[PDB]
Design a protein around this ligand. Structure first.
Ligand SMILES: Cc1cnc(Cl)c2c1[nH]c1ccc3cc(O)ccc3c12
Length: 330
């Protein structure tokens, strides 16, 4: 057999000890609420699998968000519902408030708590150094919680982090790509958005884990402190790896793939080239230098590693000196 196997270094056996029904989402029996409780007000967006609306709950008069599914890959339906139910109440995880049958589409409609957020292209230009540290800690709370519950998000991106800046409140949304981690399981590499895909995805390595989410958060951090959106700006999936290699170097890339006995797609032969690892100071200039510190760079350096096993875990990340200046609640 070809590729060397891999395991999460934390929360490894979390699912294997749980009752079968916790992770066996296929068997879950959906509890339906009352569709007439809700009234659609404004369409907020169309995803790949769904349509999203601001609504209002008529029974309590409170604002709500309704995601109406478009079932073509029907398995993801029971998977997402079970994941949000398992995670409900956790820190900075969006609350699934109800599940109703939509009379028009005839499909499930997830009803979430309302969060009033601002556009990230507008918001990621405003964040002071202090505020980057604050919100990063808040994200980590969300990620450690779901990782501890045996769940990987697999789509961390600025779009999926809803932020109420006036109230300094944060929520991690869109659990449509989320999955239960089972040691030794082979996963689909076709997940996450292009700029936020970890090296494991890009080299076709299927036995990945929670550490996928940490590469992603790494990409977000780099874009914030350096003011460069996105940080790794690929034309496509292949060039995306080339973009990573121009920063982290090709020798460490070859070391990664060699450790796991993986073969790069031969398409890379004529496009990858030879690149040294860059020092993080090369991305610093007079416009972003107020967002950068020794601690910020060390922290970043420990998130953005090729080897998914060498990345900081969420809990270790919360232990980093980067977070010392941040006041905790309470
Ligand atoms: C594409 C997509 C998928 N899933 C969710 Cl929950 C959302 C989404 N877009 C939005 C936009 C605003 C939202 C506000 C919420 O309070 C909760 C979820 C969303 C969502």
């Amino acid at each position: 057999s070809g590729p060397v196997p891999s395991r999460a270094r934390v929360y490894t056996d979390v699912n294997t000890h749980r009752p079968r029904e916790y992770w066996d989402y296929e068997s879950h029996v959906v509890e339906w609420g009352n569709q007439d409780d809700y009234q659609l007000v404004r369409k907020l967006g169309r995803g790949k699998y769904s349509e999203v609306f601001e609504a209002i709950n008529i029974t309590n008069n409170e604002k709500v968000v309704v995601k109406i599914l478009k079932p073509v890959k029907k398995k993801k339906i029971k998977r997402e519902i079970k994941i949000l139910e398992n995670l409900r109440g956790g820190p900075n995880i969006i609350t699934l408030a109800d599940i109703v049958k939509d009379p028009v589409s005839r499909t499930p409609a997830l009803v979430f708590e309302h969060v009033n957020n601002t556009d990230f292209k507008q918001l990621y230009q405003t964040l002071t150094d202090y505020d980057i540290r604050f919100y990063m800690y808040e994200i980590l709370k969300a990620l450690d919680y779901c990782h501890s519950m045996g769940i990987m998000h697999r789509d961390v991106k600025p779009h999926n982090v809803m932020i109420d800046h006036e109230h300094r409140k944060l929520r991690l949304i869109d659990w449509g790509l989320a999955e239960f981690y089972h040691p030794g399981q082979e996963y689909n590499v076709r997940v996450a958005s292009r700029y936020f895909k970890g090296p494991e995805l890009l080299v076709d390595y299927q036995m990945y884990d929670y550490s996928l989410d940490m590469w992603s958060l790494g990409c977000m951090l780099a874009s914030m402190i350096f003011r460069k959106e996105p940080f790794f700006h690929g034309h496509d999936n292949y060039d995306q790896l080339v973009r990573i290699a121009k920063v982290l170097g090709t020798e460490d890339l070859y070391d990664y793939i060699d450790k796991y006995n993986i073969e790069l797609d031969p398409r890379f032969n004529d496009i990858l080239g030879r690149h040294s690892r860059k020092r993080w100071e090369r991305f610093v200039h007079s416009e972003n230098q107020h967002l950068v510190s020794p601690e910020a760079l060390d922290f970043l350096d420990k998130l953005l590693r090729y080897d998914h096993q060498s990345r900081l875990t969420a809990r270790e990340a919360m232990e980093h000196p980067y977070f010392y200046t941040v006041v905790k609640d309470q």
